A paper describes a structure:
LmrR is a transcriptional repressor regulating the expression of the multidrug ABC transporter LmrCD. In the apo state, LmrR shows high affinity for the promotor region of LmrRCD. LmrR is a homodimeric protein with the drug binding site at the dimer interface.19 Central in this binding site are two Trp residues, W96 and W96′ (residue 96 from the other monomer), oriented face-to-face at 7 Å from each other.
To assess whether the Trp analogs influence the overall structure of LmrR and its drug-binding pocket, crystal structures were determined of LmrR with bound Dau for LmrR variants 5FW, 5,6diFW, and 5,6,7triFW. The crystal structures belong to the same crystal form (space group C2 with very similar unit cell dimensions) and were refined to resolutions varying between 2.55 and 2.15 Å. Nevertheless, the electron density maps were of sufficient quality to identify the Trp analogs at positions 67 and 96 in both polypeptide chains of the dimeric LmrR variants. No major differences were observed in the backbone and side chain conformations around residues W67 and W96, compared to wild-type LmrR.19 Moreover, as shown in Figures 2 and S6, the binding mode of Dau to LmrR is not substantially affected by the presence of the fluorinated Trp analogs. Dau is bound in the same way as in the wild-type protein, with the aromatic part of Dau sandwiched between two Trp analog residues, stabilized by π–π stacking interactions. The binding affinities of LmrR for Dau and RBF decreased upon increasing degrees of fluorination of W96. Dau behaved less extreme, with the kd decreasing 6-fold.
Numbering used by the authors:
A (entry chain B): 3 to 67, 77 to 112
B (entry chain A): 5 to 69, 73 to 112
Write the structure that this text describes.
């Protein structure tokens, strides 16, 4: 099985991409994710509330009438993160190439 | 963010060891070149990371041979976790792709 700290990191990435598709409520998020995962990924409510309280605390999402939305801070951090993980991709690719030669 | 810098640092170090056993100085140099100078890791960061990885059985060390250097290696458990990790992260990418596609339809 996969490490747990890495399982949460994966779940955070997925929830944020859902909100990126559009504002959403918990039921819609778990439903959309289950379908998008061909049934394989069943998120529990309390895991989302645990995760959503933290993202709200960090200003990454906000709520309203209960819908959740990706803030402008959230959109910005998703770009930096995606670019950072891109630099990593190249570092690893450089390591492979340098190994061969 | 620090937790993302360290998570990334772990992934890079683990992939170095995937490429082959190596010693700390060689690892920092290889990463420095691979990042085109962007990532210069210090000795003490690797020692911090290698203590936790070795404790969890993800790497081990041994003495290689003029002069002697302490080499580190990815255990068979470590190779397996990298397989599991790479596969899970791959499915995540597919789930997200599905979320956009499913969105329109
Ligand atoms: C939208 O990208 C992200 C946004 C936020 C966090 C993340 C990521 C991310 O994509 C990401 C990864 O893709 C990977 C990891 C990761 O934790 C994140 C994020 O946290 C971990 C990983 O390196 C392993 C082996 O554990 C596997 C995977 O890398 C992929 C691609 C690499 N080039 C390499 O092939 C690796 C083995 O698999």
């Amino acid at each position: 099985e996969i490490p747990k700290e890495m399982l949460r990191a994966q779940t955070n990435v997925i929830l944020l991409n859902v909100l990126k598709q559009g504002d959403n409520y918990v039921y819609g998020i778990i439903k959309q994710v289950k379908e998008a995962s061909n049934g394989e990924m069943e998120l529990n409510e309390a895991t989302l509330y645990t995760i959503f309280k933290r993202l709200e605390k960090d200003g990454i999402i906000s709520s309203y009438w209960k819908y959740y939305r990706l803030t402008e801070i959230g959109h910005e951090n998703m770009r930096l993160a995606f670019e950072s993980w891109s630099r990593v991709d190249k570092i690893i690719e450089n390591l492979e190439a340098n190994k061969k030669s």
